Amino acid sequence: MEIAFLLNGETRRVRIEDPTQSLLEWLRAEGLTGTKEGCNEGDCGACTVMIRDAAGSRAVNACLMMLPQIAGKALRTIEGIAAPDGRLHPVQQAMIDHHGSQCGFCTPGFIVSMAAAHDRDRKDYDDLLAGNLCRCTGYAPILRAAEAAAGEPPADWLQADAAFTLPAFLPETSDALADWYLAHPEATLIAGGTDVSLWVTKALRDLPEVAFLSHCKDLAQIRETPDGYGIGAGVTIAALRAFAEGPHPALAGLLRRFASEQVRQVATIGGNIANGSPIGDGPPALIAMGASLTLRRGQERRRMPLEDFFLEYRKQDRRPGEFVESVTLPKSAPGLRCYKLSKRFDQDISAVCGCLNLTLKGSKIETARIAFGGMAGVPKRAAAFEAALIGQDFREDTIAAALPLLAQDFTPLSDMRASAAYRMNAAQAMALRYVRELSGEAVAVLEVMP
Amino acid sequence: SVGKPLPHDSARAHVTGQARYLDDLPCPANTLHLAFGLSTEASAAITGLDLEPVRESPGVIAVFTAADLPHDNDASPAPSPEPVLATGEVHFVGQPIFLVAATSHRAARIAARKARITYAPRPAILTLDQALAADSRFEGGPVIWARGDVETALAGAAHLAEGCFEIGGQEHFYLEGQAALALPAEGGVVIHCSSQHPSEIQHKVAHALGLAFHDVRVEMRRMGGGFGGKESQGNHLAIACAVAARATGRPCKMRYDRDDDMVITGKRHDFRIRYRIGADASGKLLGADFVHLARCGWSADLSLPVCDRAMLHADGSYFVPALRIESHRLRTNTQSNTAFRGFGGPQGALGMERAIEHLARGMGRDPAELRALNFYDPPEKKTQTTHYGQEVADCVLGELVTRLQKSANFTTRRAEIAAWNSTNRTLARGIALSPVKFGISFTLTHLNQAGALVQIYTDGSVALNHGGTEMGQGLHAKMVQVAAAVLGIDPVQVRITATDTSKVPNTSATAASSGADMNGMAVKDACETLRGRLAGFVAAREGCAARDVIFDAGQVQASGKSWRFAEIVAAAYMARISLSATGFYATPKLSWDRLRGQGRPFLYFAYGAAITEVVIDRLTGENRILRTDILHDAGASLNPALDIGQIEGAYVQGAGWLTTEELVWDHCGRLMTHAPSTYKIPAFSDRPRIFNVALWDQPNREETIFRSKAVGEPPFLLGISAFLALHDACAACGPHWPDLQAPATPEAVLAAVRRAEGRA
Ligand SMILES: Cc1cc2nc3c(=O)[nH]c(=O)nc-3n(C[C@H](O)[C@H](O)[C@H](O)COP(=O)(O)OP(=O)(O)OC[C@H]3O[C@@H](n4cnc5c(N)ncnc54)[C@H](O)[C@@H]3O)c2cc1C
Ligand code: XAX
Ligand SMILES: Nc1nc2ncc(CO)nc2c(=O)[nH]1
Ligand code: FES
Ligand code: FES
Ligand SMILES: [Ba+2]
């Protein structure tokens, strides 16, 4: 089982004997030592590498990326950012000018992230470089570098890779996968690999029976159904956020604070749902906006409201040989809001994740769709709080009066992220916040101007 | 070259990815890889230890117990012992019990978990009150220093403010984690490691192997950050490596995985500070009374000097006529806490900063004004002293703060926030100014020494070597600048060489911000010896006085004639004059008694101030720093650029300590925050949206290297202004005292909001 790919402008063919080996491992075993291991967990971006294909170019974490995934793609590492002749990237030079490096260990990751941003001409440096942790500089000099480099023309040698291409199961079509997974139910389906790769790197597990879904085009589609949007399980979080910009600015707002840019490029919506995490941020959003899930088993196809898929803690409504195929979101959801709470804003896991969605019959509450993450063992709606809210007036005092009922809906946990007290308080705090934001009051601290 | 904003010594090498770190260095095909087998109990005796499944595990070459160690089993920087491998008992969850040597890093980590260890558990001493209740402590009692009589002062104070608050610890999170490599080289070993103190590595490895010091050679080129976390925590790896290298006959490499790293190694000492501060009717301080309860962990490490510095900085920035500290260094069944940028300094200063803020609010005066009224007097019959009796005669704080407040627009903004606050009810803004007075030097006097070794080659080019280690602070760049300045040459001609115990022996740890300070001097000494030799030669050859020979801009000038530096050196070579010299410096004037808390521990103090502005969500506690303004005294800066960078970074790290970074242990002493997904250092957008840093540029009173000031640690304390601003935002929410605790997480902020609001 041999794969080929463009490594820093030069073609390379590789026999894959261990399907689970990360790209970071391979690069360093090759001597391409410029890619650093910072944590091997996704959070620090010290291993950021730049991949390219038909879809464009993006910066990803090398440590989460397993080899069979870069098959057919063009890969660019730090030691490939500078020109063949030796000339530095506008990004690299600017970083030397503006003192963007101190100890230098995170510099390779940043350069790669900035170069990819430079290639795609993207200037939202806060969200882009959130994935790259630095402990020395205080970030200020790196911003000066990024802005100074932005005025320069793109590296043409980096763009020359776009000419390219134009043991472990890798399906071509959705039907092909449905065939194989039906025969191999006990299999480890790897999509983005941003959860699965932590079982090998951290949990030191071994995965037999492996299949990579990130090579199925038809599974990674956003299509328009005459009732909403058919979003396949293969659609990446970044792409989902990209699409949501228009129809659902609330979801796009939330997905901005979903992981980092490097994780969002490869991590998928089907995997986020199929991980079945209580602190997952995909489900509560979609459950609040009334989205349905579609499961597939060969030629069989089940459909349901997303909240019903989640039965219990680490327990889902999944048959043997059944996989997550897609989700359907309605065309509009104007009353939707998304509240993610965590110690830090960027690149964090939610303590509480409030998702409120009310519709109004002019002053009075028609429908209550209020869903929470990190409040239970499963992402679920606030049944008693919702029921008590229907028929009431949409004003602070009424919502304030129903707040005790949330303490019947959930009995939250205490851990390193938050105490149960605070989690409970936050869920109640988000309800008052929803009424205030809808009444034109200033509520978001991130929106404040210096 | 000194004073030019020149770039870091490996700036291009960093940016290209060509800069080598330990795990990057190429080594022999047969290099073994090491991993520790860690304890799962907080306090137990080891009844049984079955390492059979560990040996059977694939790729494993050797497995080691404490019993398998030849000679010493100690890695403590203390006089007291701290085992590398556990000896019959365990003292915290994450203590190395055994050592695995496998053919791959992965294979060793896999094998490390395969052990079968049976424990006889004892009651653990996890919390401060427990340690205090069970008398679990170090030094056999609390260290107490008194200046004047607090008890009598506070009894007749016009305004009194008592209180107590927690200040959490801090994980260093240097991007390059702990790492070492041993190479057995004919009867002796060569160690490469990511360490701030290669001399102690040598000292430890030597005892570990039972070799004389001249048989252990440590080389260290660069760290991927250190922050104090690599001042002693490196010992364990280098010992394990040399021990395994000795036993297996082949090279051994060890690097902690990020999750091992946080579980094993120490952190910043988390303190509890109880305070009693008092002032008179005019607002001058009458007395301040402090008790420090410091968490040390299972082992001594560097707790003794850390808590000494917390006490030394308990005055903060202010003159207090009567002051007492009661410093309990408490032993707990947790990680052996260690050095961290500031070295207890921030902890003690914050105690003073919270108390003075409390007092300010308690009597209802603008904290800025009360702080201003109470600074040490400016230079120019008697100079004020610290509580430890050291004269403060370089205090610029009064003027500095006045400058900063003009440029930061302090009085206008503070009024603008007041109005904005009364427009909102969900959001609140806060602003605060925090001063920094930080003493420079090791409190352990004899460690205030550094050495250098300089070679001039016949082609004119120079090879520079000093005792200090590069962890990102631009130390090598500063020394190159100093060297090229003293010799009168272009800094291009000076090449820095990796830190080597065989080149410069008996070095101290690169700590106390004294790195550039003492090595600057040491380099200057070596260069002046060399410049002197060349000047003397030219003067003889040209017939005149040595002092009349000018060395400038790569040109030498004597008797109206002028040569290039290379021309003179080559000629001096031909003349048979040594082009090699050692340099050495010891900090003068330092003498103090630790036990009585009297004397002059510091050569000078470093000053600075920061004005921070923040927003808080009153519903959830969410918050961010909107604007920061810093005016820091770097003295006559060696490098303006490098220094601004240090301030920029140390601020963000100081603020991060008091905001989003939080260590959490479970009910069993298991560290729950042991990954970057649970420990949250400031991310890209966490930076001040308006970040203004300006150097207070005035030469140092004391004779330091080109009258610069140590800029490494002092700015870390500027992060206090962020915690003070966060408190100011909470105080804007109601009549009550907020009582904000450190760190000020969204949860901790919301608690302080609702206290001022008075909501149960
Ligand atoms: C640094 C970092 C930050 C993160 N931050 C967040 C966050 O903010 N919010 C959040 O919700 N999550 C976060 N996560 C975890 C999150 O669950 C994943 O990153 C991602 O959303 C899952 O998508 P994936 O394709 O990577 O899943 P994978 O890792 O590919 O798979 C996860 C699980 O789903 C299964 N699976 C995948 N695809 C399918 C399918 N099509 N059908 C059936 N089963 C499938 C796999 O077998 C596996 O059990 C973070 C992870 C990292 C490493
Ligand atoms: N980039 C970067 N800058 C840094 C550090 C770092 O790791 N990386 N660490 C410090 C510390 S922490 Mo201490 O006594 O050990 S507790 S000494 C010290 C320091 C070391 O450099 P001198 O000032 O001695 O030359 O500067 C700081 N600036
Ligand atoms: N920053 C700092 N580090 C130290 N390290 C070791 C020692 C040894 O006692 N002292 C100190 C000190 O006083 N300050
Ligand atoms: S190693 Fe930290 S993200 Fe890849
Ligand atoms: S520069 Fe030292 S970690 Fe980013
Ligand atoms: Ba540490």
Domains and CATH numbers, chain B: 1-123 (3.90.1170.50), 137-171+266-391 (3.30.365.10), 172-265 (3.30.365.10), 394-443+603-759 (3.30.365.10), 444-602 (3.30.365.10)
Chain B environment of A101 (Cβ under 8 Å): 8, 11, 14-15
Note if B219 is an active site residue: no
Nearest to A133 among B675, B676, B689 (CB): B676
Residue A362: partners with Cβ closer than 8 Å, 6 or more residues away: none
The full set of domains in chain A, from first to last, is 1-80 (3.10.20.30), 81-166 (1.10.150.120), 169-218 (3.30.43.10), 219-332 (3.30.465.10), 337-440 (3.30.390.50)
Contact B427 A443 (CB under 8 A): yes
| Shortest CA gap B447–chain A (Å) | 25
CB B101 within 8 A of CB B33: yes
Cα(A21) to ligand 4 centroid in Å equals: 15
3-class SS of residue B135: coil
Contact B16 A446 (CB under 8 A): no
Looking at B219, B713, B747, B757, which residue is catalytic? B713
SS3 content of chain A, % helix, strand, coil (to 5): 35, 20, 45
The answer to whether B478 faces chain A, any CB pair under 8 Å, is no
CA dist B244 and B253 (Å) reads: 9
The backbone torsions φ and ψ at residue B55, rounded to the nearest 5 degrees and listed phi first, read: -70, -40
**Pocket-testing residue among B170, B172, B340, B341, ligand 2, by greatest number of atoms within 8 A of Cβ:** B341
Contact A429 B110 (CB under 8 A): no
Per the rule left: phi > 0, alpha: psi between -120 and 50, beta: everything else, B731 is alpha
Contact B227 A135 (CB under 8 A): yes
Residue A14: partners with Cβ closer than 8 Å, 6 or more residues away: A2, A3, A4, A5, A26, A67
CA dist B437 and B346 (Å) reads: 10
Inter-helix orientation angle A107-119/A140-150, to 10°: 30
The answer to whether B626 faces chain A, any CB pair under 8 Å, is yes
Could you tell me the resolution of this structure in angstroms? 3.3
**For A42, which DSSP code?**
S
CA dist B398 and B403 (Å) reads: 9
Containing B477, the helix (H) or strand (E) segment is helix B475-487
Beta bridge partner(s), residue B193: B180
CA dist B36 and B96 (Å) reads: 6
What sections of B250-379 are H helices per DSSP?
Answer: 258-264, 303-312, 345-363, 367-374
Residue type, A357: N
CA dist B691 and B708 (Å) reads: 24
Chain B from 376 to 435: CB within 8 A of any A CB: 424-427, 429
Residue recorded with tokens 């909001």: B753
| Shortest CA gap B107–chain A (Å) | 10
Contact B678 A346 (CB under 8 A): no
3-class SS of residue A190: strand
Q: Give Cα A203 to chain centroid, integer Å.
A: 21
Residue type, A84: P
CA dist A77 and B16 (Å) reads: 10
CB B612 within 8 A of CB B721: yes
Number of helices (H), then strands (E), belonging to chain B: the values are: 19, 29
Tell me which residue of B602, B707, B80 sits closest to B345, measured CA to CA.
Answer: B602
Q: Give Cα B678 to chain centroid, integer Å.
A: 23
Chain A environment of B676 (Cβ under 8 Å): 39, 41, 43-44, 133
Nearest to B645 among A99, A126, A445 (CB): A99
Q: What angle do CA B167, B173, B179 make, to 5 degrees?
A: 135
CB A341 within 8 A of CB A353: yes
CA dist A259 and B110 (Å) reads: 28
Tokens in use for B106?
């992965």
Chain B environment of A441 (Cβ under 8 Å): 425-426
* Interstrand relation of B499-500 and A222-225 (parallel, antiparallel or unpaired): unpaired
CB B84 within 8 A of CB B239: yes
3-class SS of residue A168: coil
Buried b or exposed e, range B463-492, using 16+ CB within 10 angstroms: ebbbbbbbbbbbbbbbbbbbbbbbbbbebe
CA dist A84 and A161 (Å) reads: 13
CA dist A379 and B114 (Å) reads: 35
Residue recorded with tokens 């304390």: B717
Q: Give Cα B93 to chain centroid, integer Å.
A: 25
Tokens in use for B187?
């009867």
Chain B environment of A37 (Cβ under 8 Å): 23
CB A35 within 8 A of CB A27: yes
3-class SS of residue A225: strand
Residue recorded with tokens 């988000």: A430
Nearest to B677 among A43, A97, A426 (CB): A43
Contact B21 A127 (CB under 8 A): no
How many CB atoms lie under 10 A from the CB of residue B363?
Answer: 15
Residue recorded with tokens 């030669």: B537
Task: Judge if the upstream peptide bond of residue B743 is cis by omega within 30 degrees of 0.
Answer: yes
Burial class (CB in 10 A: 0-12, 13-18, 19+), B539: middle
CA dist B327 and B291 (Å) reads: 6
Laid out side by side, the sheet with B116-121 consists of B89-90, B44-50, B116-121
The backbone torsions φ and ψ at residue A132, rounded to the nearest 5 degrees and listed phi first, read: -95, 105
* Interstrand relation of A323-330 and A292-297 (parallel, antiparallel or unpaired): antiparallel
CB B54 within 8 A of CB B60: yes
Buried b or exposed e, range B512-532, using 16+ CB within 10 angstroms: bbbbbbbbbbbbbbbbebbbe
Laid out side by side, the sheet with A323-330 consists of A222-225, A228-232, A323-330, A292-297, A300-305
3-class SS of residue A425: helix
**Is the beta carbon of A407 within 6 A of some atom in ligand 4?**
no
The backbone torsions φ and ψ at residue B524, rounded to the nearest 5 degrees and listed phi first, read: -55, -40
Q: Give Cα B542 to chain centroid, integer Å.
A: 50
Which residues, chain by chain, have CB under 5 Å from ion ligand 6? B 172, 229, 265
**Is the beta carbon of A111 within 6 A of some atom in ligand 5?**
no
Residue A440: partners with Cβ closer than 8 Å, 6 or more residues away: none
3-class SS of residue B643: helix
Way it was determined: X-ray
CA dist B314 and B287 (Å) reads: 12
Tokens in use for A168?
């472990």
3-class SS of residue B562: strand
Containing B650, the helix (H) or strand (E) segment is helix B640-657
Beta bridge partner(s), residue B599: B592
